[PDB]
Symmetry: D3
Subunit: 257 residues, 6 copies
């Protein structure tokens, strides 16, 4: 049977929550430029694919993903001045998370994993969680538990990091449209990637501060913050397994049967 809530009938969903201990997962992405070689829905596709595989392994269900996320920031996404990128205001994203949690609680669900796939979403997801739990408390509900994470943070093994960045890891912030995402895309959605279009520029570097209005000149022209020239399907499969295994284990730990 499908692990996606949207593909279930309400009766099937009800039974799964009734069984108690049901774990729900919600992918949180964005519509953002990802250079000259990749499509713009990468941040939705990746966490969703990871969620699906984790759900298949641990018997969890996956909710429809959030398609639009917070404003792209220069130092970690090129900047919200790029065409295509379609961003939400913080209050909008926070409210969306808040509403969904409120509804899931109404269903009787008490276990949620929010899987972030867009660098800028984190703090607003966090505020959404806090405001939702605050309200649940008003209604005498304190047994709703949430696990929030950005899937790339699970790639911690020095051996894996070295396979991806033999010359040194430069941080998840400048990874935008680079080796990590491009490899995953090559393994999962190769038709949406054209490696021949990658602009092999040097890793983006910035001073210890931020400037607004965002200055287009301080970002590499392509929109990428690092080159995906060395990306490969094999690296993508490595990343995928590492993330899926790591997240599946973490969820089993936090939400035992």
């Amino acid at each position: 049977k499908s692990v996606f809530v949207g593909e279930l009938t309400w009766k099937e969903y009800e039974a799964r929550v009734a069984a108690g201990d049901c774990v729900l997962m919600l992918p949180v992405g964005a519509l953002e430029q990802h250079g000259h070689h990749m499509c713009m829905n990468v941040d939705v596709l990746l966490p969703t694919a990871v969620c699906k595989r984790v759900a298949e392994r641990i018997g969890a269900l996956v909710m429809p993903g959030l398609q639009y996320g917070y404003k792209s920031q220069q130092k970690s996404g090129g900047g919200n001045h790029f065409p295509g990128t379609t961003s939400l205001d913080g209050a909008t994203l926070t409210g969306t998370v808040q509403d969904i949690i409120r509804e899931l609680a109404r269903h009787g669900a008490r276990r949620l994993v929010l899987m972030n796939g867009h660098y800028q979403n984190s703090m607003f997801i966090v505020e959404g969680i806090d405001l939702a739990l605050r309200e649940l408390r008003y209604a005498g509900i304190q047994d709703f538990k949430v696990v929030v994470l950005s899937y790339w943070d699970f790639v911690k093994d020095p051996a894996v990091i070295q396979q991806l960045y033999p010359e040194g890891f430069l941080g998840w912030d400048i990874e935008h449209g680079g080796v990590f995402e491009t490899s995953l895309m090559l393994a999962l959605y190769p038709d949406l990637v054209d490696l021949d279009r990658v602009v092999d520029h040097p890793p983006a570097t910035f001073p210890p501060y931020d400037v607004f209005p965002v200055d287009p000149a301080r970002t590499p022209a392509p929109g990428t913050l690092s080159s995906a020239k060395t990306a490969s399907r094999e690296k993508g499969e490595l990343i995928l397994e590492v993330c899926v295994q790591g997240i599946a284990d973490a969820i089993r730990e936090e939400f035992p049967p």
Copy 2:
């Protein structure tokens, strides 16, 4: 190439963009009876948008997956499990933000295709607030067309062919013949006609009660029976909607 903005690179999108027509599916995650899945309201308008876009050369934005609270007289009620609804302000704000961004891109033509009966007024408010802000910047050439795809099935000949026993009304076409037929034609694996509870059409008094009373809604959640739903009826509906909408867009947004 793809008609979906999400599958394009930013350079491809940029090239396509104020002459390009953008389309945004607006659905919901809502119970649709014992015989159908819950993401129907996203799947259907998205499928219609895709076909319309292919025919007129438009682009489709990622659809809104969650919509306004289900209302009893037209959706069974928001008390059902699975249905995951947003507050009005949240939905309104989402539409407002997207229009602001599309305008920033240079786009000036948007079609909002609603697939969930309860969304309409919040989409309207989102549109108004967005246009209000554009006006603050001296921009008044952004044009929006909003519609619920089922409204394009209006031709008497078509209505009779689809409903030889009589039309029931869009309000109670929740998990009924219309949606189920479309699903049988587009996503048959998500429908199990054998699970359809063949009850008579739902009727209600001329008022609403809150908190919602579950007893006033058919147990299955549907408001009319899909027993006579068929793949053929779905194909007709699809063709009518796609042609009608394609024509309307060409009219409002000449190439």
Copy 3:
């Protein structure tokens, strides 16, 4: 003794709740053609509430004078002069605040009577948000009945009596026979039939366009002609509504 809360002392009000059904008219300030005034949507539901209240022993709260933005397909459009509309959040918040306060008073029975086509969904959101908060306080016995008074005019005989040429739908009724007849029966001085522009019923394609385009609406602002309106029709309408609503409320809020 008055049925209006505003005309009672707080002691009299307190006594009545200690014993009660509260009614709240929700209208708007909207253009209503060349022949009628602009506070029609407040006047009418208020007049119905008053009569219903007198019959069932209920109390009427001060009405909401401003409603949601006028929409073209059911009100001509918010581009007209005079029409003074609130944002959705504003109307929703107003309904929410009032319910909270009535609950504080100890009231637990409310009938929201809408008289403006565009208010419905925002009244609904206001109710939901208010009930959500009451739940936070452990209060779950507050019941709300919401309705648009025209929905109670369903009898075919009555309908034919009113629309000899066929029912046009409550949406295109704006400033037509129905409202004008009621105004002739209740506030004749605010109507001048000689000024009625007798144009054919407004028609629109199966979609909406924004910014609202003035040319898609009949110049007068009305969506249908009130040429055949009369005090006679008004009295018929009034009795049907008052009786139907009185019975409905008695059923939902039994003694």
Copy 4:
């Protein structure tokens, strides 16, 4: 012709705005006013004043705001009383803001906000600021607003002396007292039963406020001062002073 916008057709309204016309908006509340008076006093009075002022200067009157901000103990008894139905600050502010936006859309550029409920002031002010801020975004800076509480125009020592023989008590503790009750006796006598007035000493409070509001610190009737000496005659005197004073003020601020 009526001075009330609600009773005009949109064509008549349009002609009147076609930005020289002065619009007036009464802002009241639904609040307890003792054992002797009804609860819609704060809407009735400023509306009656607007009507008479409008007739003299040729202005138009908008439908009044029926609900105002939460009643405060020191000037209204407290929001804990039954009947009083109050809005949150944001709601009232947003209402004023929405209305100004629309009036500006009509082409109107002159507005008089007449407050009749003590607690509304600051929220009306914020609504005005937010509305003018938005108009400025569109390059509009010729929309002018005059806001006032009608009782502030009653400053004449002679008039004041008749109403408050032992001295002016302040517009804050006037709640449900001689001033409002007299105006009501002159305008809507059937809504007042002077025999039910509870003649208590003017309410006094320490130089601070306490929340949750303590009911025991407010006179039981809900009034802050006694209306025992209220009279139709006093009401007529007040009415003429206000109408005249406000009519003159508006003519000066919004010259023909």
Copy 5:
């Protein structure tokens, strides 16, 4: 030991906390004439809080540095340079958030000491919204005392001594004798009496005008002259306020 929460470790704070009295000064950054600095509204109530706290054994929270928009009739107007004001919703939300957090700590007694004439109603709304929320959580023992420190200078003998030439009124005491005298007593370096513009007390008609007309405000921004301001007057004002507030707090929050 310090009476300022900010100077304590969380353990020391925890030890002190629901019998402890917390104090929160609420000021603003506002123009105060040619002779005085702009943070007067923060400095003064904080200095009073410090002294009251030392006497009664209370703790003082970090003060609110920005307040509501300056109003002409009581502050000259928000059109002046330097004055940096918050929207009402912002100030209300800040007060609301802080109370919610203090309650979480276990605190149940709070004194909000206002020092800016315009803050009052927004502080009041913040308190109400916070208490409303606490009630949802089943908490009804949180008590709040709110006051503008200058209101405690009311004794006829004191006003007489401070104003042998007549009291002018708190509304026009902006950058006048009262504040300037307190500053001369507490922060003399931030005052330069030689720069005082000795103009007549500001007077206004019984109404308000927006956009604010700068011509209706004395050019220096003050509403009354501080020419006769003195350190002695400030010392008296301080002693009177500290004693009066300390006694009031002991009464409302007995040990």
Copy 6:
């Protein structure tokens, strides 16, 4: 003369407004058993003052309350003393201030963050304020936002401060960095003898809500300030002031 806007008369402020304005953004947060709770306001404010004196800028009254403390970088908002604002509140505060500064005619602002959790909300406040200015055709209001500790990155300086290795800014809550600065600037507000010497805090690659107190070192600190010193504080201070003064001069030149 003072570099603080609050200590100027409006005439003096008006005359000064190429002027660079600086706004410290802190918080009231628990900082272990050995240090006070207003550290996040005191430090950025101290740095702003020194930078301002050196480059001729002015300093606005600081934001005293910041966003909710997060476990992985601040121990958690479940601690006593910590008094946090909701995101919308902090965002609206920044937004309102920028609106007003622009009204004054100011066009150069430096927001100096001193609390780890504030960043994204400060960013949103900036965007919303710039959005409104754009409605008026204004595009010359420029904002530089930074967390002062990010200027301590010179390998030679890091080696001096952390001869045994840098732990990361996320766990530098009440640790060597902040404690050293406090020892150099406000020694009376620090008592090293109260430092609880526990190993650096570590967490899995995810967060859990409701926050679980058990996953945070009991003291509230995320790293030990045992080796904190006044000497280290003076070095950090000089590095930050010099680096920030240069960056501001670069972004806001004569």
